[PDB]
Amino acid sequence: QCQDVVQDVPNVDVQMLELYDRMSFKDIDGGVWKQGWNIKYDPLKYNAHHKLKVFVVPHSHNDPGWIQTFEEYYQHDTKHILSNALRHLHDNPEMKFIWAEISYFARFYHDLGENKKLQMKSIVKNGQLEFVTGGWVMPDEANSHWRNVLLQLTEGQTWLKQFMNVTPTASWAIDPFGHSPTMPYILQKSGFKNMLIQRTHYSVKKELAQQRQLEFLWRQIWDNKGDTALFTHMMPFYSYDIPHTCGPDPKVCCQFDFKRMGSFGLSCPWKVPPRTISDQNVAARSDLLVDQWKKKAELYRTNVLLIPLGDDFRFKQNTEWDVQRVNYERLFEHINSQAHFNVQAQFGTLQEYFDAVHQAERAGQAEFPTLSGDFFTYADRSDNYWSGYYTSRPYHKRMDRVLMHYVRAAEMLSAWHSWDGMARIEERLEQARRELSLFQHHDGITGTAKTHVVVDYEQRMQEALKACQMVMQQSVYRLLTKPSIYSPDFSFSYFTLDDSRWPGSGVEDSRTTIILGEDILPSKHVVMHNTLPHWREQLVDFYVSSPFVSVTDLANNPVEAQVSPVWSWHHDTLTKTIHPQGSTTKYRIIFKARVPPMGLATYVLTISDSKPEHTSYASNLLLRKNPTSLPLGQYPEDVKFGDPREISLRVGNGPTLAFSEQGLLKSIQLTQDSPHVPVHFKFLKYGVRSHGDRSGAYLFLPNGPASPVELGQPVVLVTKGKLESSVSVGLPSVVHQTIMRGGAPEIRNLVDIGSLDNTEIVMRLETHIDSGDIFYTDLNGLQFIKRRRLDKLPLQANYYPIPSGMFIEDANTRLTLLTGQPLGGSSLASGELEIMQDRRLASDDERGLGQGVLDNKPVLHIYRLVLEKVNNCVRPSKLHPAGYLTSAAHKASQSLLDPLDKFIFAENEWIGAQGQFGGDHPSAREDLDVSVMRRLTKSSAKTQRVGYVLHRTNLMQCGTPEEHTQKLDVCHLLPNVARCERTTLTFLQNLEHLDGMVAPEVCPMETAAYVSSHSS
Ligand SMILES: *[C@@H]1O[C@H](CO)[C@@H](O)[C@H](O)[C@H]1NC(C)=O
Ligand SMILES: OC[C@@H]1[C@@H](O)[C@H](O)[C@H](O)c2nccn21
């Protein structure tokens, strides 16, 4: 049983945090290898009995959207590459080619007639065309949530298994801008044996190369045993293009990119063109090329050398296939027949390279170092750190996380039944999974694509959201209607989703108001869904046409509720203030919903002509100089006014929060007797450099530390209710809201950077926590890694991805900020946290995009802020590279990422309505999640199969006694189980047939997958 992930510091050869603390970072001219040194080799190292085995691996990097849309690239480029690949590989048996992006391959394959399909299958079966990774895309590693990394891998690999009968075990990640250990975590659990990465900091490449530590067994930071390890190969040079893959001198290597001789437009920037290989020059050319290979081979431990051969959208023209193939074949024939070289070179695939390396390891020829850590933040040269894309296009970053939840919910809700083909459930789920998967591309969620490409991704994600809504609402109808009364029309809307936080108040008026009245419809059913495997209570809110509404459950038990006005903010260009207006026609009703594990609960809203017994009304206070009245229609309590002043609020037994006269948090007091702890929000802006390198979509190159946003005298709105209170303030570019429901506050920022060109807006938290230079940021929502601010690095290098959370702590106190969207952030001084909200850049940053970022739109960012006493917690030691959340902070993260879903019944009467679904579902331990529940079979299959992915996090022990909980056995969630198997995380390979058809729960920090089979 389980590894302790807290108290044992793993012993690794390279631990990236420790290596950063020691490493120099000096940007020194290394010669032809600009960022390295002049490599020397011993010519007698290789001989008749010990030859350098060189695998030249043709490839073509195909971005599913970047400068053109996916479909534009497919029509203009990729359909040709793949057509020509099919023809040339089929005609040339020794030619090889690897392919990464299954989205394009599936797009292609489904346009192929049978003859070509058969031909394609044959070049895959004979090993000439090899799929690497096999994901739908090559995902970003900074902003992506691990659940979506696994989704897009499963989408591509399930397609490959079904249509090509192959499952890749080698991964190829040549382009994401920095690399995360979440990848080997997911890959290793999905049957992978090896992986290749490229974009790591040039200083790290030089450091590892010096020690021949470019190939290593990459384990997770908390892994003491090393069972998570995956063999990784890091490429050594500046790019994956031909000039940077043959050896250390690009002026030489460029001469062996035969597409650069003129007729393809392309040329060599180092001024020496390739020349066709002939008998008159083959010897000289071979000398040149082998010398480059033998230099590159010096950086590695075995006698097996990987030479990628490709670049972006290569192998497009038939003439290009011929010019590369024929010229390399001429080199290989000469080189391999010249004993004096002691080289055997051939086209290969990636798996061939790794198979050969491991054969060399097994022969005792090499031992490999172990490594843990991550590879952020990347810089490709000088002080050009790629921390800009941790925030770029934040509207779509947030939309990613919204779609993530709705895909999970729709797959889970619809999994409980088998559906007739006419329902189109599988079709809709496939479309949603594929649009979300596509967006995980390293120019998708990263916000590094052209404006019109961003719009395409946005439209596709909008379609996905609608598809999820359709599936979820049909599922709810079926799950909550008496079976003998259930009468579906599969094109009808029984329920509409109500989402309070997307697109968000002030972003879009998309919420429907429930219209009730004594003379018309008196009442309305609403339904909440809880995707998490434990009972959950959460305040939910609805818009209603009257303030006089009562809430009941479906046993007619009253439910305590609170009504508040609907407040919207407007840039009142008449008075030149950002101020709130109250609705006179609709109101917000809020109540606590309690919902079963992975289940549903129905409530009823009912109108009355006066105040209901169990409904209370918020008070409202507008703090501003020179106030004017704010009428609220029928709302029964008048708004109060006041001059700006410090205020204090407390909901329930929860913390007391104090606010500045500018409506920004100043302090938090946890309990009535405890101290008021300074926690101050502030908004600042970064600018761009006037001379030298410009920030763009990719790069963050600030012109110095951020300067405070001048606030003036902003308007502050205070709402005080029994269930929920809030302070909102209209600041320049940001409506900032602090919401209190009785535990950790929620923060919402409506961010509209307007036409503030060349500006980045940051939210900072200033505390007196003595964190020093240490802080913690998450990786892909999966784990928290210790960061150390280094003064030897510039500010932008100390920015990291914040895909779900960050924290600082000292011996007694921790401040944790959870996010509902991936953004960039740091701790730039002891006691501070900061997180970038948006950025508007009018300049290109010279990484191939050819535009700045000037397509900003209002976005509602959501957060939770958790202040905790941690002197009693059992924490890792100072040398441990991980941190872990407390239970409160983990639940707060879950509240942002997987909130209850809300449905409003769309017609007047719901005949056969039921009160609950899932009351008998086990309520699992709080650290356990069912990350995926997906039915894997269509309704015609005699044996139905459902897949589950279980993930258990690790939470800090802080002395709260553990409650009794029920064991979750996913294999018994559906009736008539006939088998339970443990599988790889993609569901594609059976790993263990389970005794008694019981799926065991998993250890802390482990993730497992199970498939239950059912007789149907
Ligand atoms: C799929 O690949 C396997 C190798 O695991 C092979 O034995 C089998 O013949 C292939 N199945 C089909 C249907 O082609
Ligand atoms: O500079 C990074 C960009 C990537 O964003 C993109 O995905 C693409 O593959 C590419 N080719 C050349 C440059 N780039």
Ligand SMILES: [Zn+2]
């Ligand atoms: Zn790319």
